Design a protein around this ligand. Structure first.
Ligand SMILES: [Zn+2]
Ligand SMILES: [Zn+2]
Ligand SMILES: [Zn+2]
Ligand SMILES: [Zn+2]
Lengths: 209, 209, 207, 207
């Protein structure tokens, strides 16, 4: 409408004012996330192969995300896969609310499972800070999910060089923050994941219930 | 590695050099696509809610994409959904090749079905230009797929304002090109889709077999 | 109520009164007579997936992972897709009603309908559903034969044969629909022959 | 070969020698005795989905659309999830082997295993699979009760009851696993009671 017309005009102004690339990372981010990964990481266009979904998930049986991972790893020979969460995540907030929002809630049930898996931790935390912790923990679980896929396990098994990263983008300072799960093998995945969960579980004393 | 370290340094330099938003569009683009939609459309961060998958598909039964559409429409009350293809699409090229690339090929079978659906047209075209035409036709079919979802049909049925757009981004000039399918109702979807296919089917005489 | 209490009774009475699988069977959730009774097979002979309108959707993780497990792990050499007459899913896909989530699943059947719309448009309205049911089976064997899983099994020399039949409640006989693949070449040939044959209408069927 | 030719023979001989559905049945593809025989029901009483390890995955379009169609369209008031003993999918999920694509499907079972790892770690190794099979059924009824489809049916006042049983080949009896929901509150209560009960081990089961 007025909005579609302003989009076309903005595209035209941009194109006029401006006047092959091997991808080296697969980027899995969130549909809410507001700043684009290419801006954020200030890399040259085409360096990132990008999948975005709600709450940056790697669901075991999601054909969309799984096929993107298989194509990146087996076909494009991409050596780095990055899961990037972000602060003030609508998806995560959506997952925590009581509301039945319809079909999307079925997608967010995987986050709710991650909530209950870490319920003891999240339950010793004051209610108002749980959404920040869950965003962090979710990134860690998605890297773990990624490292458990048949695709990633097979790539590692045949000696293909492949690393998995889990970061959170904080808009309040523009920095990427490593959540500590970083895998180059099934063994490093296990140790790194367990270490990260343990580190995340040390709560700041001023919000312990 | 050297690449992850340069990413962190680039993020830091960017953040230091730099020193709430209602989304109004759902953007469905392609994982290959190299220029980001926010750059391309020069809109302010947070205006776009973004899903990217390989070859910018709306597959009937894709829970990932369908749930993003349902959340955008029913929850975020987004009034515009845009499917954006792009020139030199790896996904489309991947779909046309003979190679069994593995799991991803199952995802690209939907494009191959779109190929055979328009085979007569694509077969009267010289082989070397078919990938450009298929990229265009695919955008048109995905808008059609989108307008046929239970989610979109129900939104229109209850009088919710919602428009569907199908564009192609051409990097060779930076312009967004309307492929002509634009729906605000099931009826406009049908007419617009049929019109677009018919228009796309008029071939340039110098590459007719 | 009584309903569930009755099942436990009927079961307890049934049990009181009373194996390598070699086929993967993909049938329909509205099917009413089991494949095991239908085929009079020994229990455990069949590894069974049932879904609405006996579909092999390109990107259905549920059915694909069933296929992969049957083929790569169980080493099954026969995959049978069975449609049937008076199929509720096929009739649901042909109706114009918004049924909700299921309509998205049934859009794949509607694409097939469109694909063979000329064939179908020259048929009597009361015959069209049974024709779409037959075409559906052919199209799903075709989909199955086009999976990376099946193609990769053939490439590597594994013995695997795909079948597409329709069970008719009326007379209780399975009728072969003619798409039978032991390879990608035989898939293509038999799919195309199956459809070409379905396109030869008897005047009883013609509108 | 003879195999397929034999099926048509066995079928032709079977047919020569020889209904509103009220339940949605979610069973396992490795199940061997059909639900219809098992329950001694009339043909067409059961609307059947079978998949590997009788799962209701949150985001499985295949099973969810089956559920939605059963509930919103067919108006079925009972959804029965049936696991069984000697389940090949459960055993496959417990093994450490890369089976390929199917392993991704089975990771959901492995998450459940982890969820109840303490309960399971105190069990005899030869008993663990049958315990995971029982827990699986409870967890899937729970998943089913948490779908937007089922929750929305309850919200709006529709009569719908969820059940979770295990069929034992040994003695042929269905055994109720105790998670039975007619509402979200009764889901929570009965799920928690089911698991609490499963956590009371008999010394025969204890390692
Ligand atoms: Zn987010
Ligand atoms: Zn592309
Ligand atoms: Zn049927
Ligand atoms: Zn089983």
């Amino acid at each position: 409408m007025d909005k579609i017309k302003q989009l076309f005009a903005n595209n035209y102004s941009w194109a006029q004012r401006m006047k092959h690339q091997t991808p080296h990372y697969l980027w899995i981010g969130c549909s809410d996330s507001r700043v684009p990964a290419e801006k954020l990481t200030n890399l040259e266009p085409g360096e990132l192969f990008v999948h975005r979904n709600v709450a940056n998930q790697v669901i075991h049986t999601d054909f969309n995300c799984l096929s993107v991972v298989q194509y990146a790893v087996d076909v494009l020979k991409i050596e780095h896969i990055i899961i990037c969460g972000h602060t003030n995540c609508g998806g995560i907030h959506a997952a925590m609310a009581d509301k039945d929002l319809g079909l999307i809630n079925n997608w967010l049930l995987h986050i709710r499972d991650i909530w209950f898996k870490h319920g003891h931790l999240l339950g010793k935390l004051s209610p108002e800070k749980r959404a920040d912790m869950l965003t962090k923990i979710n990134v860690a679980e998605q890297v773990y999910n990624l490292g458990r896929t048949s695709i990633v396990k097979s790539a590692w098994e045949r000696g293909q060089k492949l690393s998995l990263h889990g970061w959170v983008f904080d808009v309040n300072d523009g920095f990427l923050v490593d959540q500590g799960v970083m895998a180059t093998s099934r063994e490093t995945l296990e140790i790194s994941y367990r270490n990260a969960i343990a580190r995340l579980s040390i709560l700041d004393e001023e919000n312990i219930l």
